[PDB]
């Protein structure tokens, strides 16, 4: 499955956390105002963290992260 | 399957419990106010605990965890 | 599948029962008031018992344990 | 698949019946008033019997056992 | 798949019929008034019969079996 | 998949027809008035015939066989 | 998947046509007035024809064959 | 998957088209007025053609073929 | 999965395009006025083109091609 | 999965992009006004572009490309 | 699974991110005004970024990226 994230303000970060015994950030994707990323869960990513002002859509609804 | 968690106050803990014969915390992710984590159940994680004020969405709807 | 459990009072116990020929508790997770656990059925867990005051959500609706 | 059972009064019994050519009770789980159990069908359990006053939820709706 | 059976009178019988070339009763579970059984179709059971007054729920809705 | 058949009169027959190149009755289950059978299609049964007054429930609705 | 067929009159025929390179009737089930047959598609049957006055239910609704 | 076809007039044909590199008619099933056929897609049939006056039902609704 | 095409006028063509590295017409089925074809995607067909006045039904609704 | 595309004007192109490490046009199908193409994703095509004035249907709803 | 993207202004980019331990842009697809791309998640693409004004449709509904 995947998540849809739209940056509402500049410098939002979409961060992938490692799948496995260890849980660490493997990548932080910077999103500028207005850009959208559609990101899956994958072999390497089993949790996604969102920081900054953004709108998130999933199967379960919408959620806004805040600055 | 996955859970969506938005921190409504600072220092919310998202805790992964170990899959298998033993049940112990293998990781606690700290969220500050306004941050969101989308987390799956996995080979290593078969239970997830939320401590602190947060809005939770799952297949089953919404659940609020309360202020610490 | 999984169950969502929210503790309404302090001292709620979420207990996992062993999958297999034998049925014993293998783990009791204590929840404080306001905490939420999302717990799957697994290789080792085929029944979950809730004791104490709590709100439960499953694929079939909501249920309350009391006291 | 699984069933959710809330005891509405004391000494509700949730009984697992053996999967296979033979059908006997392999376990009877005592449920006190206000407690909840969520139980799966499993390698060892292919029928579940509920005795006592209880609320039961399944994929097919709600049932109340009486007594 | 499974069936939900609630006995509405005493002595309701929930009968499992054998899967395979032969069709015979292999087990009859007796239910007293108010008791509930949730039973699956299995390797050994491919037809289930209810005799006696009962409410049945399946993937298809409700059916009542009548008083014996 | 399965069918739910309730006998509305005495002398209802639920007949299983053989799966394979040949099509023969292999079993006729006689149902008394008010009894209900829930019968699967199986390795040995690929068609089921109902004779006598009965109510049939499937995934597609309800059908009444007539006296 | 399966089809439900109810004979509205005497002399309804439910015919199975062969799966494979060839399309031949392999069996015709006679259905008398009021009788119901519930028949699957199988290894041997990949088309079913109904002749006579009858009511048919499928995944796609109802259809009436005429005498 | 399957399709349900009812003949509204005589001489409706239900035609199976061959699966594979070539596309030919392997068989035409004649349906007389009021008869109904329920026909699957199979190892041999990957398209179905209807000719004559008929009502067709599939997963996506109803379609009428018309003769002449 | 499949498409339903009904010719509303004479000389509609239903064309199968080849699955694989190359994309060419491998077959053009001519449909006269009033005829219907139900056609699958297959090992050999990964795109279907319709030319002429016709009504099309898919899982996603109806579309009309125009002559 | 597949996409349904109807040309509302002359000159619509339906373009397949290559699956794999590289992303290149492997085929451009020209659609004239009123014609429809139903196209799948396949071993060779993992993205499809539509250029010109056309009505598009997917599992997700309707979209209009502009001239 | 796939996403539908329509460019509403000129010079929109649809960017694929690499599946695997590393996260890089492997390709930017230029989408000019009014054009539509329907793009899958694949062996090589596990996240998609949109830069510029566009309408996005997914299994979850609509999202707009901004100018
Ligand atoms: N490394 C962890 C990451 C993770 C997924 N879901 C979680 C929930 C809580 C804590 C960590 C996680 C895992 O793959 O299991
Ligand atoms: N180690 C346990 C964790 C767990 C999941 N669900 C539970 C319910 C109750 C108690 C523990 C659990 C297991 O994998 O089975
Ligand atoms: N040890 C048992 C646990 C169990 C699951 N569901 C039950 C219902 C009733 C009694 C026991 C159970 C086994 O896995 O089956
Ligand atoms: N041992 C039986 C238990 C059972 C399941 N469903 C039933 C219905 C009727 C009677 C017995 C059963 C079995 O595995 O098949
Ligand atoms: N022994 C039979 C039992 C059965 C199942 N469904 C039926 C319907 C009708 C008659 C008998 C049956 C079988 O496995 O097929
Ligand atoms: N022996 C036939 C039984 C059957 C199933 N569906 C049918 C429809 C019509 C006639 C016979 C049948 C078979 O297995 O295919
Ligand atoms: N023997 C044919 C029977 C058939 C199924 N669907 C059809 C549609 C039209 C004509 C014949 C058929 C088959 O297995 O493919
Ligand atoms: N022989 C072709 C038949 C076919 C199926 N669907 C079609 C659509 C158009 C043209 C031909 C076809 C194949 O199996 O692919
Ligand atoms: N030969 C191509 C045909 C095709 C399918 N979908 C398309 C979309 C656009 C262009 C070509 C196609 C393939 O199998 O991939
Ligand atoms: N060659 C790429 C094509 C592609 C699919 N989805 C995309 C999204 C963005 C950019 C490129 C693509 C692949 O198979 O992965
Ligand atoms: N290379 C990463 C790309 C990715 C997918 N989803 C993500 C979410 C956050 C950060 C990176 C990603 C992966 O395959 O796992």
GROMACS .gro file of N, CA, C and O and ligand atoms in nm, chain J residues 17-24 46-47, chain K residues 14-17 26-29 39-45 47-48, ligand 10:
model
  123
  623UNK      N    1   0.499   0.365  -2.238
  623UNK     CA    2   0.636   0.378  -2.187
  623UNK      C    3   0.691   0.248  -2.133
  623UNK      O    4   0.625   0.165  -2.067
  624UNK      N    5   0.821   0.223  -2.155
  624UNK     CA    6   0.880   0.095  -2.120
  624UNK      C    7   0.891   0.059  -1.972
  624UNK      O    8   0.935   0.142  -1.892
  625UNK      N    9   0.858  -0.066  -1.936
  625UNK     CA   10   0.884  -0.114  -1.799
  625UNK      C   11   1.032  -0.147  -1.787
  625UNK      O   12   1.091  -0.199  -1.883
  626UNK      N   13   1.095  -0.116  -1.675
  626UNK     CA   14   1.235  -0.156  -1.653
  626UNK      C   15   1.313  -0.034  -1.605
  626UNK      O   16   1.259   0.071  -1.571
  627UNK      N   17   1.446  -0.051  -1.608
  627UNK     CA   18   1.534   0.057  -1.561
  627UNK      C   19   1.520   0.184  -1.644
  627UNK      O   20   1.537   0.293  -1.588
  628UNK      N   21   1.494   0.171  -1.773
  628UNK     CA   22   1.477   0.281  -1.866
  628UNK      C   23   1.329   0.314  -1.889
  628UNK      O   24   1.246   0.224  -1.890
  629UNK      N   25   1.300   0.441  -1.917
  629UNK     CA   26   1.166   0.485  -1.949
  629UNK      C   27   1.164   0.559  -2.084
  629UNK      O   28   1.199   0.677  -2.089
  630UNK      N   29   1.120   0.488  -2.184
  630UNK     CA   30   1.116   0.539  -2.322
  630UNK      C   31   0.982   0.502  -2.388
  630UNK      O   32   0.923   0.401  -2.348
  652UNK      N   33   0.455  -0.005  -1.838
  652UNK     CA   34   0.426   0.024  -1.697
  652UNK      C   35   0.381   0.169  -1.677
  652UNK      O   36   0.356   0.212  -1.562
  653UNK      N   37   0.368   0.246  -1.784
  653UNK     CA   38   0.312   0.381  -1.783
  653UNK      C   39   0.254   0.409  -1.922
  653UNK      O   40   0.309   0.364  -2.022
  687UNK      N   41   0.675   1.438  -1.367
  687UNK     CA   42   0.640   1.315  -1.292
  687UNK      C   43   0.768   1.233  -1.279
  687UNK      O   44   0.821   1.183  -1.378
  688UNK      N   45   0.818   1.221  -1.155
  688UNK     CA   46   0.950   1.167  -1.124
  688UNK      C   47   0.940   1.032  -1.054
  688UNK      O   48   0.872   1.015  -0.952
  689UNK      N   49   1.009   0.932  -1.108
  689UNK     CA   50   1.016   0.800  -1.041
  689UNK      C   51   1.135   0.791  -0.948
  689UNK      O   52   1.248   0.829  -0.982
  690UNK      N   53   1.117   0.738  -0.828
  690UNK     CA   54   1.221   0.716  -0.729
  690UNK      C   55   1.253   0.565  -0.725
  690UNK      O   56   1.161   0.484  -0.734
  699UNK      N   57   1.532   0.814  -1.087
  699UNK     CA   58   1.586   0.743  -1.204
  699UNK      C   59   1.533   0.805  -1.333
  699UNK      O   60   1.588   0.787  -1.442
  700UNK      N   61   1.425   0.885  -1.326
  700UNK     CA   62   1.363   0.942  -1.446
  700UNK      C   63   1.262   1.050  -1.410
  700UNK      O   64   1.184   1.031  -1.318
  701UNK      N   65   1.265   1.160  -1.483
  701UNK     CA   66   1.164   1.264  -1.480
  701UNK      C   67   1.084   1.261  -1.611
  701UNK      O   68   1.142   1.285  -1.718
  702UNK      N   69   0.955   1.231  -1.605
  702UNK     CA   70   0.873   1.236  -1.725
  702UNK      C   71   0.812   1.373  -1.739
  702UNK      O   72   0.738   1.418  -1.648
  712UNK      N   73   0.048   0.592  -1.436
  712UNK     CA   74   0.177   0.534  -1.405
  712UNK      C   75   0.168   0.434  -1.291
  712UNK      O   76   0.108   0.466  -1.189
  713UNK      N   77   0.224   0.317  -1.308
  713UNK     CA   78   0.229   0.212  -1.206
  713UNK      C   79   0.351   0.224  -1.113
  713UNK      O   80   0.455   0.282  -1.146
  714UNK      N   81   0.329   0.158  -0.997
  714UNK     CA   82   0.443   0.121  -0.912
  714UNK      C   83   0.498  -0.010  -0.971
  714UNK      O   84   0.421  -0.094  -1.018
  715UNK      N   85   0.631  -0.026  -0.969
  715UNK     CA   86   0.696  -0.133  -1.045
  715UNK      C   87   0.819  -0.185  -0.973
  715UNK      O   88   0.862  -0.139  -0.866
  716UNK      N   89   0.887  -0.283  -1.039
  716UNK     CA   90   1.013  -0.333  -0.982
  716UNK      C   91   1.112  -0.222  -0.962
  716UNK      O   92   1.190  -0.226  -0.866
  717UNK      N   93   1.114  -0.121  -1.050
  717UNK     CA   94   1.212  -0.012  -1.036
  717UNK      C   95   1.162   0.114  -0.966
  717UNK      O   96   1.245   0.193  -0.920
  718UNK      N   97   1.030   0.138  -0.955
  718UNK     CA   98   0.974   0.260  -0.900
  718UNK      C   99   0.887   0.228  -0.778
  718UNK      O  100   0.780   0.166  -0.790
  720UNK      N  101   0.827   0.499  -0.531
  720UNK     CA  102   0.769   0.628  -0.492
  720UNK      C  103   0.760   0.718  -0.616
  720UNK      O  104   0.845   0.704  -0.707
  721UNK      N  105   0.659   0.802  -0.629
  721UNK     CA  106   0.647   0.892  -0.743
  721UNK      C  107   0.630   1.034  -0.688
  721UNK      O  108   0.545   1.052  -0.596
  750LIG     N1  109   1.055   0.235  -1.666
  750LIG     C1  110   0.976   0.278  -1.547
  750LIG     C2  111   0.849   0.349  -1.597
  750LIG     C3  112   0.765   0.412  -1.490
  750LIG     C4  113   0.658   0.353  -1.429
  750LIG     N2  114   0.607   0.439  -1.332
  750LIG     C5  115   0.682   0.554  -1.331
  750LIG     C6  116   0.669   0.670  -1.253
  750LIG     C7  117   0.761   0.771  -1.273
  750LIG     C8  118   0.865   0.759  -1.369
  750LIG     C9  119   0.876   0.644  -1.445
  750LIG    C10  120   0.783   0.541  -1.429
  750LIG    C11  121   0.946   0.156  -1.460
  750LIG     O1  122   0.912   0.045  -1.510
  750LIG     O2  123   0.949   0.174  -1.334
   0.00000   0.00000   0.00000
